[PDB]
Amino acid sequence: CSTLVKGVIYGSYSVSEMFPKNFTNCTWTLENPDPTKYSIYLKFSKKDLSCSNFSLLAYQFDHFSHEKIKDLLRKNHSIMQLCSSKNAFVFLQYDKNFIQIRRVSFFEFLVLNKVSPSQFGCHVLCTWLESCCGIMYTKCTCP
Amino acid sequence: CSTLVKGVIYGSYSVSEMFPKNFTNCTWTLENPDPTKYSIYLKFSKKDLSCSNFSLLAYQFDHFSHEKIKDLLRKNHSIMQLCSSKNAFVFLQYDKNFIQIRRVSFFEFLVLNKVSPSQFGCHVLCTWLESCCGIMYTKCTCP
Amino acid sequence: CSTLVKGVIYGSYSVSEMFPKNFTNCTWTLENPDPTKYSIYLKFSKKDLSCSNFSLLAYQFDHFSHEKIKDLLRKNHSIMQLCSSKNAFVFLQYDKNFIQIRRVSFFEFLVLNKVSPSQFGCHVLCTWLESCCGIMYTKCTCP
Amino acid sequence: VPKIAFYAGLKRQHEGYEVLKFDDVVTNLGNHYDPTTGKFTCSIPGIYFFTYHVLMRGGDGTSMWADLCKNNQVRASAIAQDADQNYDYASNSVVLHLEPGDEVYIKLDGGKAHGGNNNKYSTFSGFIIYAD
Amino acid sequence: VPKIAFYAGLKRQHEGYEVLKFDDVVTNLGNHYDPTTGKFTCSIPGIYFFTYHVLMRGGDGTSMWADLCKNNQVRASAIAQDADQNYDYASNSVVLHLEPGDEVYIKLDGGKAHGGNNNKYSTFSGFIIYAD
Amino acid sequence: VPKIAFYAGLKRQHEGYEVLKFDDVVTNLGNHYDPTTGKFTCSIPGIYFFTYHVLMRGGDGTSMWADLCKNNQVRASAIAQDADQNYDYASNSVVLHLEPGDEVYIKLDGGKAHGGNNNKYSTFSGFIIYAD
Ligand SMILES: [Ca+2]
Ligand SMILES: [Ca+2]
Ligand SMILES: [Ca+2]
Ligand SMILES: [Ca+2]
Ligand SMILES: [Ca+2]
Ligand SMILES: [Ca+2]
Ligand SMILES: [Ca+2]
Numbered sequence: 001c002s003t004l005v006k007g008v009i010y011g012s013y014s015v016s017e018m019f020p021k022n023f024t025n026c027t028w029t030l031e032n033p034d035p036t037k038y039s040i041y042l043k044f045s046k047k048d049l050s051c052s053n054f055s056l057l058a059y060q061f062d063h064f065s066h067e068k069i070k071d072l073l074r075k076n077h078s079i080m081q082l083c084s085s086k087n088a089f090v091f092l093q094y095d096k097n098f099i100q101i102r103r104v105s106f107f108e109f110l111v112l113n114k115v116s117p118s119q120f121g122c123h124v125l126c127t128w129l130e131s132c133c134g135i136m137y138t139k140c141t142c143p
Numbered sequence: 144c145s146t147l148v149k150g151v152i153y154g155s156y157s158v159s160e161m162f163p164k165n166f167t168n169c170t171w172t173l174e175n176p177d178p179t180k181y182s183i184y185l186k187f188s189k190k191d192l193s194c195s196n197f198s199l200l201a202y203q204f205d206h207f208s209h210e211k212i213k214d215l216l217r218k219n220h221s222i223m224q225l226c227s228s229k230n231a232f233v234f235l236q237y238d239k240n241f242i243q244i245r246r247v248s249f250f251e252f253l254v255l256n257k258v259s260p261s262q263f264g265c266h267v268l269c270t271w272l273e274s275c276c277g278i279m280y281t282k283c284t285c286p
Numbered sequence: 287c288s289t290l291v292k293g294v295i296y297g298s299y300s301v302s303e304m305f306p307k308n309f310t311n312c313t314w315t316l317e318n319p320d321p322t323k324y325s326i327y328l329k330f331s332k333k334d335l336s337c338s339n340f341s342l343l344a345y346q347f348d349h350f351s352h353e354k355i356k357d358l359l360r361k362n363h364s365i366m367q368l369c370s371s372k373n374a375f376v377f378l379q380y381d382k383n384f385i386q387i388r389r390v391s392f393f394e395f396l397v398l399n400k401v402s403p404s405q406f407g408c409h410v411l412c413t414w415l416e417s418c419c420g421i422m423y424t425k426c427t428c429p
Numbered sequence: 430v431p432k433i434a435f436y437a438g439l440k441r442q443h444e445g446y447e448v449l450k451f452d453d454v455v456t457n458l459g460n461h462y463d464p465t466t467g468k469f470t471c472s473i474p475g476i477y478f479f480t481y482h483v484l485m486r487g488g489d490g491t492s493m494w495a496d497l498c499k500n501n502q503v504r505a506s507a508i509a510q511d512a513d514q515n516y517d518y519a520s521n522s523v524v525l526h527l528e529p530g531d532e533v534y535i536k537l538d539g540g541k542a543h544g545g546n547n548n549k550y551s552t553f554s555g556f557i558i559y560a561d
Numbered sequence: 562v563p564k565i566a567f568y569a570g571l572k573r574q575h576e577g578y579e580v581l582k583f584d585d586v587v588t589n590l591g592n593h594y595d596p597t598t599g600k601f602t603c604s605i606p607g608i609y610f611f612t613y614h615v616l617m618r619g620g621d622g623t624s625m626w627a628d629l630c631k632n633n634q635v636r637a638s639a640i641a642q643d644a645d646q647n648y649d650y651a652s653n654s655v656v657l658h659l660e661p662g663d664e665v666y667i668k669l670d671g672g673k674a675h676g677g678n679n680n681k682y683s684t685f686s687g688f689i690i691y692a693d
Numbered sequence: 694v695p696k697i698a699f700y701a702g703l704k705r706q707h708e709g710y711e712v713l714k715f716d717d718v719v720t721n722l723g724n725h726y727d728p729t730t731g732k733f734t735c736s737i738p739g740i741y742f743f744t745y746h747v748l749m750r751g752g753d754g755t756s757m758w759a760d761l762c763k764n765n766q767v768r769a770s771a772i773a774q775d776a777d778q779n780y781d782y783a784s785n786s787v788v789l790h791l792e793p794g795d796e797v798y799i800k801l802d803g804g805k806a807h808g809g810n811n812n813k814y815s816t817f818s819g820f821i822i823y824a825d
Contacts, residue, residue, distance in 0.1 A: 036648055062574050063572065399671075432740070455787070456740065476590060505681050508648045515781075520614065520652065523681075524566050548770045554787065558566055635813070652784065656818045691694065
């Protein structure tokens with residue numbers, strides 16, 4: 001159970017859409033087209049997200065390797081706990097080749113251009129600036 | 144009517160010499176041998192320069208194209224107006240591939256080495272330091 | 287009379303060992319494996335070293351050329367005088383391709399890694415930190 | 430044997446996401462490179478080697494991507510980056526297989542190149558190694 | 562007569578002193594390059610040309626050495642360095658003579674390389690020019 | 694195809710507007726490269742490919758120009774620049790047409806090249822592709 005959304009500047013996915021399988025063990029992946037050029041910003045909505053019988057693991061990596069994912073999970077020192085996040089909205093930045101969210105209420109990402117952000121890209125991020133609180137923002141400035 | 148002085152570290156030209164044609168529409172050009180290495184400094188003298196029936200346009204570009212010159216002229220937001228310069232001496236720096244002066248009292252230029260200026264080059268520029276006033280001077284220092 | 291100790295991270299040489307020839311005119315050389323990567327640190331012990339009838343010249347160069355050594359000696363503006371050193375221990379740094387000590391009580395050197403010093407390399411240098419006094423030390427820190 | 434080999438410097442400055450047109454053609458053996466468009470159009474199928482050196486313009490722009498694009502796919506990527514805005518190269522070399530019509534070209538992917546005039550700082554070299 | 566020529570990008574990032582395994586093979590004529598090990602094993606003795614471009618990993622690591630090693634000896638060395646931690650290439654190019662079994666490969670000698678998936682920023686190119 | 698191909702590293706440090714003498718000769722097929730002078734003298738006319746990588750010295754020197762000069766004219770220019778005085782390569786590749794007697798060589802046009810001893814950081818590669 002592994003689907004990867006390869007080419008998208010932006011994308012809004014519901015929990016049901018990103019995991020359209022009855023089996024609770026599935027991985028949803030987002031490939032960064034070019035980490036030299038783009039930085040992927042993730043946004044998590046907990047307005048209707050629930051974790052009664054589901055675990056939300058947010059992490060990044062560089063290459064497809066099951067042993068790598070297992071070792072990262074066993075590390076358990078920097079993996080994001082979406083369910084155990086105090087703030088309603090979770091903002092994450094992932095400047096690495098791959099982003100994968102696995103399953104063990106929607107969320108939107110943004111493949112922003114690192115040095116020359118597009119008009120739409122910086123507009124979406126300026127809307128995410130409504131965090132509230134420490135956040136990561138880029139060079140492009142918007143009120 | 145287009146003459147270009149290609150290889151010269153230094154050069155002194157009178158208004159008559161740089162435009163040796165009866166027709167008032169002529170262009171005088173100075174090619175920078177290597178903009179990675181050299182920065183061309185221009186010097187303008189208004190001691191006997193007159194613009195009763197002549198227009199002095201000072202500008203720069205990168206490639207020979209009449210359309211480019213026309214578009215630059217229609218821009219007219221940063222083109223130097225030698226005739227309408229309050230100061231007697233006009234000092235200009237042009238770190239671009241080409242320098243062209245067109246006609247619609249002399250002037251001297253200097254193809255200085257940007258990082259390792261020669262003994263003669265930094266000497267000529269040190270004499271041009273007698274502007275008076277805002278000037279652009281290079282790394283090499285001289286009393 | 288020229289021996290060169292090519293491959294050694296560390297090396298302890300006595301005056302007799304580095305010059306095992308009856309002739310008083312001999313050169314002992316130490317080739318830096320990679321100056322882009324390594325910086326050679328020298329250490330001189332004057333506990334039993336004597337210069338009653340011997341001259342200790344410490345210098346560096348880039349390529350094997352007798353004329354280069356002669357010109358450097360005739361320069362005599364930065365060549366180290368081991369015999370005429372007030373402090374008992376002499377610490378020298380040589381970030382150049384070759385190090386040669388010529389003869390006209392031991393000494394130890396260290397081919398340290400410039401950017402990623404090894405565990406042993408930084409340990410040896412931390413022991414040399416016991417100069418006493420101005421010394422040259424690298425990024426790696428040790429009490 | 431087929432003799433295809435070219436080399437051309439970059440006479441004019443480029444910027445943005447435009448195909449680099451290396452007009453300073455030193456060699457165009459076979460006339461398989463077109464400086465007006467800047468594309469090397471294969472005609473004899475075979476395995477070609479292309480190298481490109483693209484000087485990032487100094488002074489403005491701290492990053493420049495020059496991707497050797499084959500047809501509509503990026504077959505190599507080069508990034509010239511310098512936080513102090515120096516003259517760093519975005520160079521790379523490829524050994525691609527080409528069929529007739531395959532237009533191999535260097536396309537800027539978000540930076541300003543350097544116009545060397547006749548200096549030939551930024552270049553585009555390439556030759557056929559074997560013919561299929 | 563013999564057609565040996567390869568080109569491969571660096572799909573996975575590397576670090577330290579490990580042989581670079583360019584697993585993004587675009588050309589592998591003769592199948593004389595092995596992405597699993599990352600070594601071009603000569604089979605037909607002759608004079609070969611190899612070029613490698615290895616992008617230093619941006620962000621972390623101010624220096625990176627990528628030496629084209631022939632068997633157990635460094636036939637070329639390239640250093641990518643940037644005090645501001647930019648993307649600089651440790652590229653170099655060699656024309657080596659090779660006997661059968663000579664494994665030519667690019668081996669990091671410090672610093673971290675960049676893994677570009679299918680981008681092919683960091684490449685390893687090489688072909689046989691002559692055979693004995 | 695007559696076999697002309699060479700590759701040599703920079704054993705000795707260089708500085709200023711002097712021809713680079715790559716004395717660390719690895720390949721000198723045909724003995725058409727002379728490390729004592731540092732010039733590749735063509736003998737059989739034809740289309741040649743030359744690439745040079747010239748590491749500039751770390752420490753002293755902020756910019757270094759290494760132009761592949763063909764006889765008395767600059768057939769390519771490379772600038773290695775780093776405001777932080779790092780190591781950067783002034784590399785470039787050319788595909789030049791050469792007549793007998795033409796002397797292709799890399800001449801520094803400012804700055805100091807790095808003397809890599811046997812490391813072969815700064816290199817000069819080149820081979821004949823076609824014999825006219
Ligand atoms: Ca790209
Ligand atoms: Ca090495
Ligand atoms: Ca570079
Ligand atoms: Ca030049
Ligand atoms: Ca750089
Ligand atoms: Ca820099
Ligand atoms: Ca800096």
